[PDB]
Ligand binder design. Structure first.
Ligand SMILES: Cc1cc2nc3c(=O)[nH]c(=O)nc-3n(C[C@H](O)[C@H](O)[C@H](O)COP(=O)(O)OP(=O)(O)OC[C@H]3O[C@@H](n4cnc5c(N)ncnc54)[C@H](O)[C@@H]3O)c2cc1C
Ligand SMILES: Cc1cc2nc3c(=O)[nH]c(=O)nc-3n(C[C@H](O)[C@H](O)[C@H](O)COP(=O)(O)OP(=O)(O)OC[C@H]3O[C@@H](n4cnc5c(N)ncnc54)[C@H](O)[C@@H]3O)c2cc1C
Lengths: 436, 438
């Protein structure tokens, strides 16, 4: 009931959304635990921008997984446009998806464009690309590039400020946040008679609840045996600081994304920094799995640098698109952790062996744009009224992860077109921003 | 009569006056005085500009006339000196020069007048992409609609005309030339005559400055100190600056001059203030007032202003829309009008006066005088010494017969804007830029 005690582990993208939605449904006793103050330095959703896109599928070209995803993004788009908690942070500037070989371009055509009801604008030449943004922004030769522009129902979101907005509103509606170490740093789930009855934090305190929701992003994989359903995987981002005049052209830009090179989004309003992500299948940090002798398990760590090879990939993206920026010094960089499920659908379900536990994990590279509404679906799952087509897709499904190949590229491209391992990156082979 | 012990007065401490003072000093003239109403660099000198275009072209045989052959002689000498003379060399940037137009007629005029006669090997620019690739990414962003052009890669570029003039002034001073600059003390109001010859100059303070020879090199202002018999038309063009930001400016380096003969040109941002200069091209403004000595006739009279007509700003922004549209709406940081004087054939006028042999005139820059800075004082000193070389001397001679019944509104091979000579007297008081006004 709305009087039952609930604990949410993780005050990131999905945890803050969940807290807000539970408060909105009249839940009176909700406590959220995080080792860090919002926004957490290790939250994937702690980012000056993320991509938001919604596409409806053609009737004749639907499958269950993509139909479920469309249901998530349909709700998200409506909320980004109408919910005052989120509306200020959605910039509906459009979204370009592109590649630079015939194989990549065909893949996009077949998987993204043809199944979709969206009316795309086709971009055939370098001039087509450059004309999508104001003069002086795109200056590159886009060698071999073709792609498609989705003009509306897409853009970017200020994920960090949207998360803070949700946090603030959830507090206003009476949600208690314990965010800080050691008091919010959960070190174990607490079991009694085969069920989860709450969480233990690093201060020794045991927090008891009628329901416990595990929404701690990539860090969740350390708190529960997910039976290989989660792969903690990292991607890489860097910023360039734009100057006070030049930055004024760089406004209201569609997202530009080449699925095997990277993407950038327009400079932020606060620091005037332009973010580039270099696209690749991801880094893992493969260490011995303590519970599975002879096996490996990807284990997150935090770092505000990126591998030199990642910087180089970013500068190659800039060469193609904005070569006037390709030699600019980085003002900031970091690695950023999410977790992939085996099919890269979300994992939102009550645990079959521990029914008081709900897991809400597996953003799989697509969780941030869900922020406004994901907590509603998670609350639905808590209340056993998650609609069936979504439910069946995001169910607990360890049978799909038996003998998982951690080095599967899972429909990502770029760089060496394989999963990379941070254990193979030399200590001296990182960016050194702010070091000298 | 003439020797290096002889007193010389130079009227006008501008582009040509400072060059002349330097050359006289180098040649060992010991008693040289230069007069100007203003301290160097004068605010009304056409040479007082953060950049000007320098270009030299060798002509094919058959494709020159004596006038263009003379001009080539001037610019050949100038180029060699811009690349070598320690006083001038630091201020020449050999970045190249693009000449272009945006109609078939304009493009054909350039082909036949500039390209075909020239020994230069040009790079042809056919497309917008061709143009944009002449400069670093982020600089040229426009569509260049209808443009075609030719790029001249070497033997051309831009000069820091203001700093080069200051350099020449400093070195003339160091070598012992005396500069009287300021008003009234250096503001010459008349030449002084005795026995039908010129014996010096009278300044606004009533003082008479006497010398054995007098050189009149006062630019457009020369026209009010001597009866040039209509050989000079004082004519003004327009420039404005945009202030570039500290990051964006770093791409705008080592740029060839871009010039559309019916729209304008720009040159790269200056090192000190990061200001990007645009000139809108047109046949010129005159300021037509009654000729005090020719009843019923008009005479163009210069005045100074650090604004430009709003119509000129608009033409400059039109040029930017075609080429660098990301800049086309930027506020101006500075603008002014800038005066030169055209002769009837836009060759220079450098000669002893046939009725007053102690007077040498060195005038008529005709839109092409600034690039001559390093060497023009040598030619002027040659004329003073009656040894101006044969390749130029008859082209730049005193020639009032060419100016009889001169049509002041002839466009004299310029294009752009309304394609006619414009009149400041028809520009409304409220129709100027208002930079720096509350
Ligand atoms: C580089 C990069 C680019 C991306 N681009 C996009 C995109 O453009 N669009 C998009 O939709 N998605 C994007 N994603 C994916 C998106 O960021 C994630 O799917 C989403 O943010 C995950 O949300 P989350 O709440 O599960 O995890 P997070 O937002 O990471 O939140 C997890 C929280 O759990 C906390 N936590 C950790 N350990 C514990 C503990 N022991 N106890 C309590 N709390 C704990 C952390 O401090 C953190 O606050 C991207 C991800 C990355 C890395
Ligand atoms: C906007 C514009 C752009 C141009 N672009 C180019 C270019 O790209 N390349 C190029 O080669 N040329 C160019 N020119 C032409 C060039 O500037 C002139 O031909 C040259 O500067 C003329 O030099 P000058 O010494 O005759 O006159 P100025 O440099 O004007 O000097 C005349 C001097 O005489 C002084 N004076 C005036 N009245 C008196 C008086 N009563 N007594 C004493 N002194 C007096 C003034 O104070 C001034 O210092 C341009 C001109 C303008 C207006």
């Amino acid at each position: 009931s709305t009087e039952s005690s609930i604990i949410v582990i993780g005050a990131g993208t999905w945890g803050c959304s969940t807290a807000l939605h539970l408060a909105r449904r009249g839940y009176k006793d909700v406590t959220v635990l995080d080792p860090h103050p919002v926004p957490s330095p290790i939250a994937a959703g702690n980012d000056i921008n993320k991509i938001m896109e919604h596409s409806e599928l053609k009737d004749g070209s639907s499958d269950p997984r993509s139909a479920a995803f469309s249901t998530f993004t349909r709700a998200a788009l409506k909320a980004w446009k109408t919910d005052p908690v989120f509306q200020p942070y959605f910039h509906e500037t459009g979204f370009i998806i592109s590649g630079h070989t015939p194989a990549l371009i065909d893949h996009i055509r077949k998987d993204e464009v043809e199944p979709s009801e969206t009316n795309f604008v086709k971009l055939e030449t370098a001039e087509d690309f450059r004309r999508t943004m104001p003069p002086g922004v795109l200056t590159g030769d886009f060698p071999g590039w073709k792609g498609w522009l989705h003009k509306s129902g897409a853009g970017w979101i200020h994920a960090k400020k949207a998360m803070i907005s949700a946090f603030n509103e959830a507090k206003r509606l009476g949600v208690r946040f314990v965010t800080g170490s050691p008091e919010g740093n959960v070190v174990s789930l607490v079991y009694e008679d085969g069920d989860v009855v709450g969480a233990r934090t690093a201060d020794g305190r045991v927090h008891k609840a009628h329901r416990t929701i595990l929404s701690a992003g990539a860090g969740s994989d350390s708190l529960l045996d997910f039976k290989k359903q989660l792969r903690p995987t990292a991607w890489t981002l860097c910023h360039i600081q734009m100057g006070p005049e030049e930055v004024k052209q760089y406004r209201n830009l569609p997202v530009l994304f080449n699925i095997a090179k990277g993407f950038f989004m327009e400079p932020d309003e606060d620091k005037h920094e332009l973010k580039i992500c270099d696209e690749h299948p991801g880094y893992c940090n493969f260490l011995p799995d303590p519970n599975r002798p002879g096996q490996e398990k990807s284990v997150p760590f935090a770092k505000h640098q990126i591998p030199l090879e990642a910087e180089a990939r970013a500068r190659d993206f800039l060469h193609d698109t904005m070569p006037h920026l390709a030699d600019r010094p980085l003002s900031f960089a970091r690695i950023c952790w999410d977790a992939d499920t085996p099919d890269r659908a979300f994992l939102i379900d009550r645990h079959p062996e521990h029914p008081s536990l709900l897991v809400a994990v597996g953003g799989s590279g697509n969780g941030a744009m869900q922020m406004p509404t994901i907590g509603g679906f998670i609350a639905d799952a808590l209340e056993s009224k998650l609609q069936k087509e979504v439910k069946d897709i995001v169910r607990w499904r360890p049978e799909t992860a038996v003998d998982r190949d951690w080095r599967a590229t899972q429909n990502r491209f770029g760089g060496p077109d394989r999963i990379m391992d941070f254990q193979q990156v030399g200590e001296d082979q990182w960016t050194k921003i702010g070091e000298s």
